[PDB]
C-alpha cells in the first residue's frame, strides 16, 4: 500500500433512508478507522474512538456539529436542486460527498473532493487547476456556481493544509491503536459435499488491513478454482478474509493455506 496515512470524510443524503432511519449521515475515517459520526436525527457530531475523545474538548465537537449541521442543510436543499435538474420528482435519490487527504510513502501529499448523484459521478474537484470537473451536463450549473468567488481557493487550502495538519494530529493521537498489529487467527475447514471437496481458509481479526492469502498444492501456489471474498470488517476495527478452493475428495492433505501479513514475522502455513 502506497499510502501511509489517510483522512477521509464522507456523507450521504437520501430521500428514502428507510423507516425511522436518518436521511443524512456523515462519518470520518483515519487510516480506514471510523473516528467520528453525525446524522440528521442525533444532530450531533460525536467521537467514535477513545483516542479522539481523549484529545478533543467540547468546543472541538461543537465546531464539528456546526459544520455537520451546515452540510446537512446544504444537502437538504441539494436533494431538491438535483432532482429538479434531472427533471425528477419523488422516488429514491441520493447525494454523496467524499473528500480528504492522503500522506503517501515518501512524503507526497494527495487531496480530493468529489460528489455523486444516485451513486454515479456528478462532479469532482481538480485542485491542480482549481476548477471543478463536471461528469455530466447536469453538473455544469454546479461547476459554474463553485468556480465563482473564492470557494475553490478555500477548498484547495483545506485539502493541502488544514486537512493534512489535522491528519497528522489524529495519527499522533491514536498511534498506539492505529500503529498496532493484530495477529490473524486462522481456520481451515473442508466440506465434502458434492463429488467436490471445497477447502476454506479464514483469517480472523488481523490488523492492519493489507493481507495476502493463498492456496498451495504440493507446495506450489494454486490458482485454479480459487475464490476470494476480499477483506471485510469486524466490529472492533480488525478485519476478516476468506478464500476457498475446489479440490478432489481425498486430496485434502495436499493443500495448505498461506497467510502473509505484517503481524507475522514469517508467512503462516495452515493445513486442514
Amino acid at each position: 500500500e502506497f499510502e501511509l496515512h489517510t483522512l477521509r470524510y464522507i456523507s450521504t443524503a437520501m430521500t428514502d433512508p428507510g423507516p425511522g432511519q436518518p436521511w443524512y449521515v456523515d462519518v470520518g475515517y483515519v487510516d480506514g478507522e471510523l473516528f467520528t459520526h453525525y446524522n440528521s436525527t442525533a444532530r450531533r457530531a460525536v467521537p467514535r474512538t477513545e483516542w479522539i475523545a481523549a484529545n478533543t474538548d467540547q468546543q472541538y465537537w461543537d465546531s464539528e456539529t456546526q459544520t455537520s449541521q451546515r452540510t446537512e442543510q446544504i444537502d437538504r436543499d441539494g436533494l431538491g436542486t438535483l432532482q429538479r435538474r434531472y427533471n425528477q420528482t419523488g422516488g429514491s435519490h441520493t447525494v454523496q460527498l467524499m473528500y480528504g487527504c492522503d500522506i503517501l510513502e515518501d512524503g507526497t501529499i494527495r487531496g480530493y473532493s468529489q460528489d455523486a448523484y444516485d451513486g454515479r459521478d456528478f462532479i469532482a474537484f481538480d485542485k491542480d487547476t482549481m476548477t471543478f470537473t463536471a461528469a455530466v451536463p447536469e453538473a455544469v450549473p454546479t461547476k459554474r456556481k463553485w468556480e465563482e468567488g473564492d470557494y475553490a481557493e478555500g477548498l484547495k487550502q483545506y485539502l493541502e493544509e488544514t486537512c493534512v495538519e489535522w491528519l497528522r494530529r489524529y495519527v499522533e493521537y491514536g498511534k498506539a491503536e492505529l500503529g498496532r498489529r493484530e495477529r490473524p487467527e486462522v481456520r481451515v475447514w473442508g466440506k465434502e459435499a458434492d463429488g467436490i471437496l471445497t477447502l476454506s481458509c479464514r483469517a480472523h481479526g488481523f490488523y492492519p488491513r493489507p493481507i495476502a492469502v493463498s492456496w498451495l498444492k504440493d507446495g506450489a501456489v494454486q490458482g485454479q478454482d480459487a475464490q476470494s471474498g476480499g477483506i471485510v470488517p469486524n466490529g472492533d476495527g480488525t478485519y476478516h478474509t476468506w478464500v476457498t478452493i475446489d479440490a478432489q475428495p481425498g486430496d485434502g492433505d495436499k493443500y495448505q493455506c498461506r497467510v502473509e501479513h505484517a503481524s507475522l514475522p514469517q508467512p503462516g502455513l495452515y493445513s486442514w
Binding site: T12, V25, M98, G119, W189, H204, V232, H240
Partner: protein
Amino acid sequence: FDLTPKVQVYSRFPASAGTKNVLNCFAAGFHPPKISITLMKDGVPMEGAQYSDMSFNDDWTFQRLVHADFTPSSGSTYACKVEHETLKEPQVYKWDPEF
C-alpha cells in the same frame, strides 16, 4: 443503476462450541442505500444485533456491518436475512460454524 448486495456471514473468531464470539453479517456493493439486514438464530431474529451507520466505498457503493455477541452452540443454526429492492424475495445466508 441499482446494484444488488454482496453478503457475507462470518464469526469474529474461529468458532468453537461454548466459546464467546461475535456473529457478523456484511452487505456491500449495493444501491440504493436502503436495506434490511437481520441476524438470525434458529429461524428467528437474533438477539443483541448492532448496526453500523450508513457508509460507502470508493466506488460510491453502500455497505453495512451488522454484528451480535454470541456463544456458538452445535444444535443451533445461525444465518443472515437480507432484504433489498433489487431482491424479489429476502435472501438468507447461512453461517457455517466450520466446527
